[PDB]
């Protein structure tokens, strides 16, 4: 059980195509990982709740990782965030 905080890099609006970027990507592990922006964590493809929140204008947000993948599938978001620009290192 592992969090990993990030902000949005590319001001986009973390659209369908960044938004699910990042839940596509958080959102295909074996282990526990969601988005949290503003203090709101959430299956990153939990578009409901995403939907509402959702990032972009350098906004700021939160994943988490837990269980197996929680390695692979928070690194994969994390270097997705710097890698889709859509969050920093």
């Excluded at 709101?40 to 409901?48: F, G």
């Excluded at 994943?63 to 993948?69: H, L, M, Q, R, S």
């Amino acid at each position: 059980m592992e969090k990993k905080e990030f902000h949005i890099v590319a001001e986009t609006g973390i659209h369908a195509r960044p938004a699910t970027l990042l839940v596509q990507t958080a959102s295909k592990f074996n282990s526990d990982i969601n988005l949290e922006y503003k203090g709101k964590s959430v299956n990153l493809k939990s578009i409901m709740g995403v939907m509402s929140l959702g990032v972009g204008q350098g906004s700021d947000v939160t994943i988490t990782v837990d269980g197996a993948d929680e390695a692979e599938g928070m690194a994969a978001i994390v270097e997705t965030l710097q890698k889709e620009g859509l969050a920093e290192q």
